[PDB]
Amino acid sequence: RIAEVDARVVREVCSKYFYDQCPAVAGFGPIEQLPDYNRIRSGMFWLRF
Amino acid sequence: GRQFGHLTRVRHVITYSLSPFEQRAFPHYFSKGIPNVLRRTRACILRVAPPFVAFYLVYTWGTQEFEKSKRKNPA
């Protein structure tokens, strides 16, 4: 199964699960600088792509 | 100027947020919004209205008086 994996498979699987998806975030401690949820969500895609 | 992480000190406060693609943008727009609008209207009518009512009465009285004064009187 490992030998079957190449670059194309990685690009497709990662796009399937990461790109333009809503994450769940958990923060604890001095997290005043933790970005707003909208900014995190906007960080999940690229305008250049 | 100032920056996040240097504003003030806060302890023991939890915040729960939901994604915008998971919820409605207009969930109770009329079923809840209209009662709140009436609440705010009632809450501010007595502060805002009486000055402008006094203006309306001075406007109408002054215009009526100016109109009557331009008409002549016998003798």
Side-chain angles (χ1 to χ4, degrees), chain B residues 21-69:
Chain B
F21 299 83
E22 294 272 358
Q23 54 185 322
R24 306 165 185 277
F26 304 95
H28 304 101
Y29 189 85
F30 306 110
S31 183
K32 275 190 171 293
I34 291 163
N36 202 36
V37 171
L38 305 178
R39 187 187 59 73
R40 296 197 268 161
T41 306
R42 190 192 317 161
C44 78
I45 188 68
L46 296 177
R47 297 99 183 281
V48 183
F52 297 88
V53 171
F55 161 79
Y56 167 72
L57 303 178
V58 173
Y59 167 83
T60 57
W61 174 90
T63 294
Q64 284 181 232
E65 176 58 293
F66 173 79
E67 172 153 23
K68 185 162 187 175
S69 65

Short mmCIF file of all heavy atoms in Angstrom, two decimals, chain B residues 21-69:
data_model
loop_
_atom_site.label_atom_id
_atom_site.label_comp_id
_atom_site.label_asym_id
_atom_site.label_seq_id
_atom_site.Cartn_x
_atom_site.Cartn_y
_atom_site.Cartn_z
N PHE B 21 -20.69 28.68 8.08
CA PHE B 21 -21.31 27.71 7.18
C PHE B 21 -22.16 26.68 7.90
O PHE B 21 -22.72 25.80 7.24
CB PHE B 21 -20.27 26.98 6.34
CG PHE B 21 -19.44 27.87 5.47
CD1 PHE B 21 -18.34 28.55 5.96
CD2 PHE B 21 -19.75 28.01 4.13
CE1 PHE B 21 -17.59 29.35 5.14
CE2 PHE B 21 -19.00 28.82 3.31
CZ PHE B 21 -17.92 29.48 3.81
N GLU B 22 -22.27 26.74 9.23
CA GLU B 22 -23.05 25.79 10.00
C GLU B 22 -24.37 26.36 10.50
O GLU B 22 -25.17 25.60 11.06
CB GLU B 22 -22.25 25.30 11.20
CG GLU B 22 -21.02 24.46 10.83
CD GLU B 22 -21.29 22.98 10.68
OE1 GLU B 22 -22.43 22.53 10.90
OE2 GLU B 22 -20.34 22.25 10.33
N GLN B 23 -24.62 27.67 10.36
CA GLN B 23 -25.78 28.31 10.97
C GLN B 23 -26.45 29.26 9.99
O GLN B 23 -25.90 29.60 8.94
CB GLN B 23 -25.36 29.08 12.23
CG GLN B 23 -24.23 30.07 11.99
CD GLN B 23 -23.76 30.71 13.27
OE1 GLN B 23 -24.55 31.01 14.15
NE2 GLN B 23 -22.46 30.92 13.37
N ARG B 24 -27.65 29.70 10.37
CA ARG B 24 -28.46 30.60 9.55
C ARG B 24 -28.00 32.05 9.72
O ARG B 24 -27.60 32.46 10.81
CB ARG B 24 -29.93 30.52 9.96
CG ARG B 24 -30.58 29.15 9.97
CD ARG B 24 -31.90 29.22 10.74
NE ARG B 24 -32.57 27.94 10.93
CZ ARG B 24 -33.36 27.35 10.04
NH1 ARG B 24 -33.63 27.90 8.86
NH2 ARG B 24 -33.94 26.20 10.36
N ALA B 25 -28.08 32.82 8.64
CA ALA B 25 -27.85 34.26 8.72
C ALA B 25 -29.10 35.04 9.13
O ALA B 25 -28.97 36.14 9.68
CB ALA B 25 -27.36 34.79 7.37
N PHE B 26 -30.29 34.48 8.90
CA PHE B 26 -31.58 35.07 9.26
C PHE B 26 -32.39 34.02 10.01
O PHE B 26 -33.39 33.51 9.49
CB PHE B 26 -32.34 35.55 8.02
CG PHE B 26 -31.59 36.53 7.17
CD1 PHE B 26 -30.87 36.10 6.08
CD2 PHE B 26 -31.64 37.88 7.44
CE1 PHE B 26 -30.20 37.00 5.28
CE2 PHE B 26 -30.97 38.78 6.65
CZ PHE B 26 -30.24 38.34 5.57
N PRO B 27 -32.00 33.67 11.23
CA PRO B 27 -32.76 32.65 11.96
C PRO B 27 -34.11 33.05 12.55
O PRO B 27 -35.06 32.28 12.43
CB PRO B 27 -31.79 32.26 13.09
CG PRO B 27 -31.01 33.49 13.33
CD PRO B 27 -30.83 34.14 11.99
N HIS B 28 -34.22 34.21 13.19
CA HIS B 28 -35.49 34.68 13.75
C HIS B 28 -35.65 36.16 13.44
O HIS B 28 -35.91 36.98 14.32
CB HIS B 28 -35.58 34.41 15.25
CG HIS B 28 -35.40 32.97 15.61
ND1 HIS B 28 -34.21 32.48 16.11
CD2 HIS B 28 -36.25 31.92 15.56
CE1 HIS B 28 -34.34 31.18 16.34
NE2 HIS B 28 -35.57 30.82 16.02
N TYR B 29 -35.49 36.51 12.16
CA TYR B 29 -35.44 37.91 11.76
C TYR B 29 -36.72 38.65 12.11
O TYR B 29 -36.67 39.75 12.68
CB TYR B 29 -35.15 38.00 10.26
CG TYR B 29 -34.85 39.40 9.78
CD1 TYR B 29 -33.57 39.92 9.87
CD2 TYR B 29 -35.85 40.20 9.25
CE1 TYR B 29 -33.28 41.19 9.44
CE2 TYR B 29 -35.57 41.48 8.81
CZ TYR B 29 -34.29 41.97 8.91
OH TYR B 29 -34.00 43.25 8.48
N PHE B 30 -37.88 38.07 11.79
CA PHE B 30 -39.16 38.70 12.12
C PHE B 30 -39.76 38.20 13.43
O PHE B 30 -40.36 39.00 14.16
CB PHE B 30 -40.17 38.45 11.00
CG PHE B 30 -39.69 38.87 9.64
CD1 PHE B 30 -39.38 37.94 8.68
CD2 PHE B 30 -39.56 40.21 9.34
CE1 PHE B 30 -38.94 38.33 7.43
CE2 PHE B 30 -39.12 40.61 8.09
CZ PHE B 30 -38.81 39.67 7.14
N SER B 31 -39.63 36.92 13.74
CA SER B 31 -40.24 36.39 14.96
C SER B 31 -39.62 36.97 16.23
O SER B 31 -40.30 37.02 17.26
CB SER B 31 -40.13 34.87 14.98
OG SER B 31 -40.77 34.34 16.13
N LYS B 32 -38.36 37.40 16.18
CA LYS B 32 -37.67 38.04 17.30
C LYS B 32 -37.26 39.48 17.05
O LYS B 32 -37.18 40.25 18.01
CB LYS B 32 -36.41 37.25 17.66
CG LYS B 32 -36.66 36.09 18.61
CD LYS B 32 -35.35 35.50 19.11
CE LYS B 32 -35.59 34.50 20.23
NZ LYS B 32 -36.11 35.14 21.47
N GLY B 33 -37.01 39.88 15.81
CA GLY B 33 -36.53 41.23 15.56
C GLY B 33 -37.58 42.30 15.80
O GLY B 33 -37.28 43.35 16.37
N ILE B 34 -38.81 42.06 15.36
CA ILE B 34 -39.86 43.07 15.51
C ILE B 34 -40.16 43.39 16.98
O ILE B 34 -40.26 44.58 17.31
CB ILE B 34 -41.12 42.65 14.72
CG1 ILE B 34 -40.83 42.73 13.21
CG2 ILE B 34 -42.32 43.51 15.10
CD1 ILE B 34 -41.81 41.98 12.34
N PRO B 35 -40.35 42.41 17.88
CA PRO B 35 -40.45 42.76 19.31
C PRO B 35 -39.29 43.59 19.83
O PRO B 35 -39.51 44.52 20.63
CB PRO B 35 -40.52 41.39 19.99
CG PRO B 35 -41.11 40.51 18.99
CD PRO B 35 -40.66 40.99 17.64
N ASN B 36 -38.07 43.33 19.37
CA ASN B 36 -36.94 44.10 19.87
C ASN B 36 -36.97 45.52 19.34
O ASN B 36 -36.62 46.47 20.05
CB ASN B 36 -35.63 43.40 19.49
CG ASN B 36 -34.47 43.80 20.37
OD1 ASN B 36 -34.62 44.02 21.57
ND2 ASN B 36 -33.29 43.88 19.77
N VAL B 37 -37.43 45.70 18.09
CA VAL B 37 -37.54 47.04 17.53
C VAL B 37 -38.58 47.83 18.30
O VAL B 37 -38.39 49.02 18.59
CB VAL B 37 -37.87 46.97 16.03
CG1 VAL B 37 -38.22 48.35 15.49
CG2 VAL B 37 -36.69 46.41 15.25
N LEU B 38 -39.71 47.20 18.65
CA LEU B 38 -40.71 47.90 19.44
C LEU B 38 -40.18 48.25 20.82
O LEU B 38 -40.48 49.32 21.36
CB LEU B 38 -42.00 47.09 19.56
CG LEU B 38 -42.70 46.63 18.29
CD1 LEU B 38 -43.92 45.80 18.64
CD2 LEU B 38 -43.08 47.82 17.42
N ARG B 39 -39.37 47.36 21.40
CA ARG B 39 -38.77 47.64 22.71
C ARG B 39 -37.90 48.89 22.64
O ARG B 39 -38.00 49.78 23.48
CB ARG B 39 -37.96 46.44 23.18
CG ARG B 39 -37.44 46.56 24.62
CD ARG B 39 -36.49 45.42 24.99
NE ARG B 39 -35.32 45.35 24.12
CZ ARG B 39 -34.30 46.19 24.13
NH1 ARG B 39 -34.26 47.22 24.96
NH2 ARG B 39 -33.29 46.01 23.29
N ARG B 40 -37.02 48.96 21.63
CA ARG B 40 -36.12 50.11 21.52
C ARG B 40 -36.90 51.39 21.21
O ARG B 40 -36.57 52.47 21.74
CB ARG B 40 -35.07 49.83 20.46
CG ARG B 40 -34.15 48.67 20.81
CD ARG B 40 -32.88 48.64 19.99
NE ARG B 40 -33.02 47.83 18.79
CZ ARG B 40 -32.24 47.90 17.72
NH1 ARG B 40 -31.24 48.77 17.64
NH2 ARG B 40 -32.47 47.08 16.70
N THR B 41 -37.95 51.29 20.39
CA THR B 41 -38.76 52.46 20.08
C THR B 41 -39.39 53.00 21.36
O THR B 41 -39.36 54.22 21.61
CB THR B 41 -39.84 52.10 19.06
OG1 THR B 41 -39.24 51.51 17.91
CG2 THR B 41 -40.62 53.33 18.65
N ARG B 42 -40.00 52.12 22.14
CA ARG B 42 -40.61 52.54 23.40
C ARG B 42 -39.55 53.13 24.31
O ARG B 42 -39.79 54.11 25.02
CB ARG B 42 -41.29 51.34 24.06
CG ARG B 42 -42.16 51.66 25.26
CD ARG B 42 -42.55 50.39 26.00
NE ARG B 42 -42.94 49.30 25.10
CZ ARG B 42 -42.98 48.02 25.42
NH1 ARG B 42 -42.67 47.59 26.63
NH2 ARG B 42 -43.33 47.13 24.49
N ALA B 43 -38.35 52.54 24.30
CA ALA B 43 -37.30 52.93 25.22
C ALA B 43 -36.77 54.33 24.93
O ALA B 43 -36.25 54.98 25.84
CB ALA B 43 -36.15 51.93 25.16
N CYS B 44 -36.90 54.82 23.68
CA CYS B 44 -36.32 56.11 23.32
C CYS B 44 -37.33 57.17 22.87
O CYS B 44 -36.92 58.31 22.59
CB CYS B 44 -35.29 55.92 22.20
SG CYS B 44 -36.01 55.70 20.56
N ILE B 45 -38.62 56.84 22.80
CA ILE B 45 -39.58 57.79 22.24
C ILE B 45 -39.68 59.02 23.14
O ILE B 45 -39.74 60.16 22.64
CB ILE B 45 -40.95 57.11 22.03
CG1 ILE B 45 -41.93 58.02 21.27
CG2 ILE B 45 -41.60 56.71 23.36
CD1 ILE B 45 -41.56 58.26 19.83
N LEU B 46 -39.66 58.83 24.46
CA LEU B 46 -39.83 59.95 25.39
C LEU B 46 -38.61 60.85 25.45
O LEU B 46 -38.74 62.00 25.87
CB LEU B 46 -40.14 59.42 26.78
CG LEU B 46 -41.44 58.64 26.96
CD1 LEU B 46 -41.55 58.14 28.39
CD2 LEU B 46 -42.65 59.49 26.61
N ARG B 47 -37.44 60.36 25.04
CA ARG B 47 -36.25 61.20 25.00
C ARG B 47 -36.15 61.97 23.69
O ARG B 47 -35.68 63.11 23.70
CB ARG B 47 -34.98 60.37 25.21
CG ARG B 47 -34.91 59.71 26.58
CD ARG B 47 -35.33 58.26 26.55
NE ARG B 47 -35.32 57.69 27.89
CZ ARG B 47 -34.23 57.29 28.54
NH1 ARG B 47 -33.02 57.39 28.01
NH2 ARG B 47 -34.36 56.78 29.76
N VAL B 48 -36.59 61.38 22.58
CA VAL B 48 -36.38 62.01 21.28
C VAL B 48 -37.56 62.89 20.86
O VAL B 48 -37.36 63.97 20.30
CB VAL B 48 -36.06 60.94 20.21
CG1 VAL B 48 -35.77 61.61 18.87
CG2 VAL B 48 -34.87 60.10 20.64
N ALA B 49 -38.80 62.49 21.13
CA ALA B 49 -39.95 63.15 20.50
C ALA B 49 -40.27 64.56 20.98
O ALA B 49 -40.51 65.43 20.12
CB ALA B 49 -41.18 62.25 20.62
N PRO B 50 -40.35 64.86 22.28
CA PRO B 50 -40.92 66.17 22.72
C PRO B 50 -40.19 67.39 22.18
O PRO B 50 -40.85 68.40 21.89
CB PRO B 50 -40.82 66.10 24.26
CG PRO B 50 -40.75 64.67 24.57
CD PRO B 50 -40.01 64.03 23.45
N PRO B 51 -38.85 67.37 22.04
CA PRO B 51 -38.20 68.53 21.38
C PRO B 51 -38.74 68.79 19.98
O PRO B 51 -39.07 69.94 19.64
CB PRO B 51 -36.73 68.13 21.37
CG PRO B 51 -36.57 67.29 22.55
CD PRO B 51 -37.84 66.50 22.67
N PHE B 52 -38.84 67.76 19.16
CA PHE B 52 -39.31 67.96 17.79
C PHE B 52 -40.80 68.25 17.73
O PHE B 52 -41.25 68.94 16.81
CB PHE B 52 -38.96 66.74 16.95
CG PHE B 52 -37.48 66.50 16.82
CD1 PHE B 52 -36.81 65.74 17.75
CD2 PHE B 52 -36.77 67.06 15.77
CE1 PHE B 52 -35.45 65.53 17.64
CE2 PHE B 52 -35.42 66.85 15.65
CZ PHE B 52 -34.76 66.09 16.59
N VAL B 53 -41.58 67.78 18.71
CA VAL B 53 -42.97 68.23 18.78
C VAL B 53 -43.04 69.72 19.07
O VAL B 53 -43.83 70.45 18.46
CB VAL B 53 -43.74 67.41 19.83
CG1 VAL B 53 -45.12 67.99 20.07
CG2 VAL B 53 -43.85 65.96 19.39
N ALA B 54 -42.19 70.21 19.98
CA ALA B 54 -42.16 71.64 20.26
C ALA B 54 -41.74 72.42 19.02
O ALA B 54 -42.29 73.50 18.74
CB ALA B 54 -41.21 71.92 21.42
N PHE B 55 -40.82 71.86 18.23
CA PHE B 55 -40.44 72.52 16.98
C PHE B 55 -41.61 72.56 16.01
O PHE B 55 -41.81 73.57 15.33
CB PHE B 55 -39.25 71.80 16.35
CG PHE B 55 -39.07 72.10 14.89
CD1 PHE B 55 -38.48 73.27 14.47
CD2 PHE B 55 -39.46 71.18 13.93
CE1 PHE B 55 -38.32 73.54 13.12
CE2 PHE B 55 -39.29 71.44 12.59
CZ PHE B 55 -38.72 72.62 12.19
N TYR B 56 -42.37 71.47 15.91
CA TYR B 56 -43.48 71.44 14.96
C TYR B 56 -44.53 72.48 15.32
O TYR B 56 -45.06 73.18 14.44
CB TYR B 56 -44.10 70.05 14.93
CG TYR B 56 -45.43 70.00 14.21
CD1 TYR B 56 -45.49 70.13 12.83
CD2 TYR B 56 -46.62 69.86 14.91
CE1 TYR B 56 -46.70 70.09 12.17
CE2 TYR B 56 -47.83 69.83 14.25
CZ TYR B 56 -47.86 69.94 12.88
OH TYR B 56 -49.06 69.91 12.22
N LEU B 57 -44.80 72.64 16.62
CA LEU B 57 -45.80 73.62 17.04
C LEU B 57 -45.31 75.04 16.82
O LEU B 57 -46.08 75.90 16.36
CB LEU B 57 -46.18 73.41 18.50
CG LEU B 57 -46.72 72.04 18.91
CD1 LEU B 57 -46.99 72.00 20.41
CD2 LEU B 57 -47.99 71.71 18.15
N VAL B 58 -44.04 75.31 17.10
CA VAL B 58 -43.53 76.66 16.83
C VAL B 58 -43.51 76.94 15.33
O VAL B 58 -43.82 78.06 14.91
CB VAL B 58 -42.13 76.84 17.45
CG1 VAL B 58 -41.52 78.16 17.03
CG2 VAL B 58 -42.21 76.77 18.97
N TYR B 59 -43.24 75.92 14.51
CA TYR B 59 -43.25 76.11 13.06
C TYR B 59 -44.63 76.49 12.57
O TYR B 59 -44.80 77.48 11.84
CB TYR B 59 -42.76 74.83 12.37
CG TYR B 59 -43.01 74.80 10.88
CD1 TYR B 59 -42.14 75.42 10.01
CD2 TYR B 59 -44.11 74.14 10.35
CE1 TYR B 59 -42.35 75.40 8.65
CE2 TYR B 59 -44.34 74.12 8.99
CZ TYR B 59 -43.45 74.75 8.15
OH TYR B 59 -43.67 74.73 6.79
N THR B 60 -45.65 75.74 12.99
CA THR B 60 -47.00 75.99 12.48
C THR B 60 -47.54 77.31 12.99
O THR B 60 -48.15 78.07 12.23
CB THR B 60 -47.95 74.86 12.85
OG1 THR B 60 -47.96 74.69 14.27
CG2 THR B 60 -47.54 73.56 12.17
N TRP B 61 -47.33 77.62 14.28
CA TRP B 61 -47.79 78.89 14.81
C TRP B 61 -47.12 80.06 14.10
O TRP B 61 -47.78 81.03 13.72
CB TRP B 61 -47.56 78.95 16.31
CG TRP B 61 -47.87 80.27 16.93
CD1 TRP B 61 -49.07 80.66 17.44
CD2 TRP B 61 -46.97 81.36 17.15
NE1 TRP B 61 -48.98 81.93 17.94
CE2 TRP B 61 -47.70 82.38 17.78
CE3 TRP B 61 -45.62 81.56 16.87
CZ2 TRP B 61 -47.12 83.60 18.12
CZ3 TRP B 61 -45.05 82.77 17.22
CH2 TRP B 61 -45.80 83.77 17.84
N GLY B 62 -45.79 80.00 13.94
CA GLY B 62 -45.09 81.09 13.27
C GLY B 62 -45.50 81.28 11.83
O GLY B 62 -45.63 82.42 11.36
N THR B 63 -45.81 80.19 11.12
CA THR B 63 -46.23 80.33 9.73
C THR B 63 -47.64 80.88 9.63
O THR B 63 -47.92 81.73 8.78
CB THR B 63 -46.13 78.98 9.02
OG1 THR B 63 -44.76 78.58 8.93
CG2 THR B 63 -46.72 79.05 7.62
N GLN B 64 -48.54 80.43 10.51
CA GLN B 64 -49.90 80.97 10.50
C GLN B 64 -49.87 82.46 10.83
O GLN B 64 -50.57 83.26 10.18
CB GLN B 64 -50.78 80.21 11.47
CG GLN B 64 -51.21 78.85 10.94
CD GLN B 64 -52.12 78.10 11.89
OE1 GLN B 64 -51.86 76.94 12.21
NE2 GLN B 64 -53.19 78.75 12.32
N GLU B 65 -49.13 82.84 11.86
CA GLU B 65 -49.05 84.25 12.23
C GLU B 65 -48.47 85.08 11.09
O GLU B 65 -48.99 86.16 10.80
CB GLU B 65 -48.20 84.39 13.50
CG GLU B 65 -47.94 85.81 13.99
CD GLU B 65 -49.21 86.59 14.28
OE1 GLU B 65 -49.97 86.89 13.34
OE2 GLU B 65 -49.44 86.90 15.47
N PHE B 66 -47.41 84.60 10.44
CA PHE B 66 -46.85 85.37 9.33
C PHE B 66 -47.83 85.50 8.18
O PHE B 66 -47.85 86.52 7.50
CB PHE B 66 -45.56 84.73 8.82
CG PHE B 66 -45.02 85.38 7.58
CD1 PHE B 66 -44.32 86.57 7.66
CD2 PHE B 66 -45.21 84.80 6.34
CE1 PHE B 66 -43.82 87.17 6.52
CE2 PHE B 66 -44.72 85.40 5.20
CZ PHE B 66 -44.02 86.58 5.29
N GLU B 67 -48.66 84.48 7.96
CA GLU B 67 -49.63 84.57 6.88
C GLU B 67 -50.72 85.58 7.22
O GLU B 67 -51.14 86.36 6.36
CB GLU B 67 -50.24 83.20 6.58
CG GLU B 67 -51.39 83.27 5.59
CD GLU B 67 -51.59 82.00 4.80
OE1 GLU B 67 -51.15 80.93 5.26
OE2 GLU B 67 -52.18 82.08 3.71
N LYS B 68 -51.19 85.57 8.47
CA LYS B 68 -52.27 86.47 8.85
C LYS B 68 -51.78 87.91 8.89
O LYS B 68 -52.54 88.83 8.56
CB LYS B 68 -52.84 86.06 10.20
CG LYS B 68 -54.05 86.88 10.60
CD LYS B 68 -54.86 86.20 11.68
CE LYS B 68 -56.15 86.96 11.94
NZ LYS B 68 -57.04 86.26 12.91
N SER B 69 -50.54 88.13 9.30
CA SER B 69 -50.02 89.50 9.39
C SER B 69 -49.93 90.18 8.02
O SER B 69 -50.02 91.41 7.95
CB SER B 69 -48.65 89.49 10.06
OG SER B 69 -47.70 88.80 9.27
#
